[PDB]
Ligand binder design. Structure first.
Ligand code: TTP
Ligand code: MG
Length: 388
DNA sequence: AGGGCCCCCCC
DNA sequence: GGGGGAAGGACCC
């Protein structure tokens, strides 16, 4: 039995912007990214704003919406890693998911605490925060005790995140990642919830569509629907065999175990970043077939700010999509090597890599289905994977 | 909007 | 029978 905690920060970007300009922590705030309010503080989430596009929307219903541009991600990424590192201090095995979510495997830490505790104060163990579904605690239930201890470590992490970094967020404590992630969102404004085993089904059936289950995105959702599957119970009771003969024995078994709140996936130690991507606009809304720029911009600070961590990349990749349907149907990249020696220097002559990156990108692009809708249709994305 | 595991060669 | 490198998927924050 594992004790996993899922940490999810409150409207992350807004938080990082509010901490920068205090005169914002009192009025409806939204962070804008090319006519798309990616997020906003709760002091505006009540005003109908739901991370929706159209900058004008909230604007009207909030003159002093004071929107801030969040295109440059530097500040967010830095705070993101400070959160992960603080968490890593509590326990080494920490997995990142986006810039503001972290899973932490607390199993060993919980045990170390229990063993350290007396055979009398064990009945004094209490919970920190909410108990999902207001379920009654049984102090003689070893799993209840361990999960309550987990709730205590979660409260400590949130407290330390606030005292040391000035950030608030929610936490969810459960026996696996799926359940921890689902329960962390029960009481969302800066609070935490722990899930005792007997309430697992209640939590899973509280969802209104199999697509709300972590591990089932836009794709599988559609495939399950066309198969007569919309509710969680529909998946739990669907014939395994047929499911297996539709998504494979791999996906079928996994997808179906999730419907029961079963997930054995391990919390992965993310450690340092395995790549340094950095997309750009003027190609999703309107572009001029730029090039010398789609290489100096995309790869701007992406260079002078890669020596900080002191690590060398060995591969470049350009991702490209197109004007499609359904949802965001558009995945078409292009990767290549990155010569060492002079290219991967360590002195002043770093500009020399500018040109080389040009020709490659400007070759892997002209080979991007240049015949049917490959131009001007939302794209632009470069990567720096493979580092050692 | 910005960021981050899973066919072909040539041996 | 056996590796390494591309180009793209696929899935998520
Ligand atoms: C999902 C998603 C998140 N993000 C960014 C915005 C968020 O600040 C950050 C974290 O993802 P989220 O957690 O889903 O966004 P949030 O923290 O603002 O919302 P909540 O308080 O309800 O948990 O990453 C994107 O840029 N694009 C996306 O498609
Ligand atoms: Mg969040």
């Amino acid at each position: 039995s594992r004790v996993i905690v899922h940490v999810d920060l409150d409207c992350f970007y807004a938080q990082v912007e509010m901490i920068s300009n205090p005169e914002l922590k009192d009025k409806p705030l939204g962070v804008q990214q090319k006519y798309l309010v990616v997020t906003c503080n709760y002091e505006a989430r009540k005003l109908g704003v739901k991370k929706l596009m159209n900058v004008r929307d909230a604007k009207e219903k909030c003159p002093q919406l004071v929107l801030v541009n969040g295109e440059d991600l530097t500040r967010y990424r830095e705070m993101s890693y400070k959160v992960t590192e603080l968490l890593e201090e509590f326990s080494p095995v920490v997995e990142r998911l986006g810039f503001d979510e972290n899973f932490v495997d607390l199993t060993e830490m919980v045990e170390k605490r229990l063993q350290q505790l007396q055979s009398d104060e064990l009945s004094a163990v209490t919970v920190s925060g909410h108990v999902y579904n207001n379920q009654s605690i049984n102090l003689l239930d070893v799993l209840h005790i361990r999960l309550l201890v987990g709730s205590q470590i979660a409260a400590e992490m949130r407290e330390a995140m606030y005292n040391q970094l000035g950030l608030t967020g929610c936490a969810g404590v459960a026996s696996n990642k799926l359940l921890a992630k689902l329960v962390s969102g029960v009481f969302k404004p800066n609070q935490q919830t722990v899930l005792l085993p007997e309430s697992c089904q209640h939590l899973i059936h509280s969802l209104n569509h199999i697509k709300e289950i972590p591990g089932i995105g836009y794709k599988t959702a559609k495939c399950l629907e066309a198969l007569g599957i919309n509710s969680v119970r529909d998946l739990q009771t669907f014939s395994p065999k047929i499911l297996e003969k539709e998504l494979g024995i791999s996906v079928a078994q996994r997808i179906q175990k999730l419907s029961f709140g079963e997930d054995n996936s391990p919390v992965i130690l993310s450690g340092p970043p395995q790549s340094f991507s950095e997309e750009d606009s003027f190609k999703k809304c309107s572009s001029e077939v730029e090039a010398k720029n789609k290489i100096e911009e995309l790869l701007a600070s992406l260079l002078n700010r890669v020596c900080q961590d002191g690590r060398k990349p060995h591969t470049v990749r350009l991702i490209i999509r197109r004007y499609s349907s359904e949802k965001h149907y558009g995945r078409e990249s292009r990767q290549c090597p990155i010569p060492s020696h002079v290219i991967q220097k360590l002195g002043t002559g770093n500009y020399d890599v500018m040109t080389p990156m040009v020709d490659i990108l400007m070759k892997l692009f002209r080979n991007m289905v240049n015949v049917k809708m490959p131009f001007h249709l939302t794209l632009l994305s470069v990567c720096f994977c493979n580092l050692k």
